[PDB]
Ligand binder design. Structure first.
Ligand code: S7A
Length: 435
């Protein structure tokens, strides 16, 4: 497994022990062979669980999610998938790791796809080994994989709005339920309906994940309402999963705007990971999985794969060479390697718009490639009338850094900057020059 030119997919079923049992064994062997090694966690929550499974082993934790006093003699580094890709893009030298281990390797965020592309290219080149740990590798067609204990799978209509009748089975349950919804806004409506019925609800999404996930351990709850982020190794002490089987798909239209299409079917990999939250305890058979739609290959033409290509085109590999996407996920985007390669100054602006600006990859690229500098926010106000961002059914407004009240009307419209109240609040701060 650990020899150069080898990429291994460790595809044991969800809950088979890849992280707590296999990962420590791989790490001890890597340390024995003096292999400079990187371990990639999808989230800060998974990073903290990894420190528990690897306690006593000399591992350098490159995350503030763990409070450890490093010895300085570690040859194994652990960081998030996003941190690995970010450090590659920044001028900082990243060691050329002999062994690259990615946990929850199915993660489809642009930075995780870019990390797989870079690592798999180094393996193809004969320069490194890699291990991708996931029950659901790219292109998997099985939404019902094995589990630690039998699961009751039931196809049923699942509410996507508040309801007054017709879904008694949802509230009649006396255990704990994890409910996957297509968006933060959809979860808000379902959570309000459940709270009005006397239920204790926790809501999870990308921006609130670490903070809110702690509540699943610190307090008694009846329902967790979550977006697709809980497919990335989040573990719950639950006996039921309710799965809408739906998600939002970012789509670039005519190369000039990004919309959030759908809700539409999830992939088989996503469905298998949502279901995989339960059936994990061999002593508790009969956990339930209620699903409300079919699966489809909705990663085809999904913006994240084009965004992954924008990131990889701006990462140095060797001379003018550019890393390809990991082969099983390379047909998801029709893109020419190198088409998004930016010159030195525009590349620095592109990195800063993502790192400090917190903009989506696609939007950061449109701004940097137009020759606009990081602090120049005139583009947030000079788009066409159809690009007006709305808040409470009225045009959103901000005070510019000049002290003028203007309507938010970006030159390039990316639906992700206003997908929920939290995102639009962050984008207003950016348009005003506050970061
Ligand atoms: O809340 C935000 C920041 C905003 F773009 F809106 F400024 N997000 C999360 C990161 N991706 C873009 C959307």
């Amino acid at each position: 497994m650990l020899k150069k030119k080898q990429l291994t997919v460790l595809d044991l079923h969800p809950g088979a022990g890849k992280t707590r049992r296999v990962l420590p064994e791989i790490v001890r062997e890597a340390i024995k062979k003096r292999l400079r090694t990187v371990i990639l966690a999808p989230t800060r929550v998974v990073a903290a669980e990894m420190e528990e499974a690897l306690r006593g082993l000399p591992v350098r934790y490159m995350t503030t999610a763990v409070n450890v006093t490093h010895s300085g003699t570690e040859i194994v580094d652990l960081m998030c998938h996003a941190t690995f890709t970010s450090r590659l893009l920044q001028p900082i030298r990243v060691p050329n790791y002999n062994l690259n281990i990615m946990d929850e390797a199915h993660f489809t965020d642009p930075s995780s796809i870019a990390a797989r592309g870079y690592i798999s290219t180094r393996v193809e080149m004969g320069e490194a080994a890699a291990i991708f740990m996931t029950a659901t590798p790219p292109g998997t067609r099985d939404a019902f994989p094995d589990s630690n204990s039998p699961i009751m799978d039931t196809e049923v209509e699942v509410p996507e709005r508040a309801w007054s009748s017709g879904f008694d089975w949802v509230t009649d349950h006396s255990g704990k339920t994890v409910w996957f919804v297509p968006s933060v806004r959809n979860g808000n409506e379902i959570a309000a309906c459940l709270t009005k019925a006397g239920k204790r609800v926790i809501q999870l999404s990308r921006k609130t994940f670490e903070t809110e996930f702690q509540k699943t351990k610190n307090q008694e709850w009846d329902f967790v309402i979550t977006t697709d982020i809980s497919e990335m190794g989040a573990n719950f002490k639950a006996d039921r999963v309710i799965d809408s089987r739906r998600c939002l798909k970012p789509v670039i239209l005519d190369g000039e705007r990004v919309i959030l299409a759908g809700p539409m079917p999830v992939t088989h990999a996503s469905a298998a990971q949502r279901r995989g939250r339960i059936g994990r305890n061999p002593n508790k058979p009969g956990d339930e999985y209620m699903y409300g739609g079919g699966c489809a290959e909705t990663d085809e033409g999904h913006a994240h794969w084009l965004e992954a290509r924008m990131l990889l085109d701006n990462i140095y590999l060797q001379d003018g060479l550019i890393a390809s996407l990991y082969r099983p996920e390379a047909d998801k985007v029709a893109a020419i390697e190198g088409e998004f390669k930016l010159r030195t100054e525009q590349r620095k602006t592109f990195v800063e718009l993502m790192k400090r600006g917190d903009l989506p990859v696609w939007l950061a690229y449109q701004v940097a490639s137009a020759g606009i500098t990081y602090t120049d926010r005139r583009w947030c106000f000079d788009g066409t009338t159809n690009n007006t961002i709305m808040e409470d059914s009225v045009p959103a407004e901000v005070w510019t850094k000049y002290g003028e009240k203007r309507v938010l009307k970006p030159r390039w419209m990316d639906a992700r900057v206003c997908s929920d109240h939290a995102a639009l609040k962050s984008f207003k701060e950016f348009a005003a020059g506050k970061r």
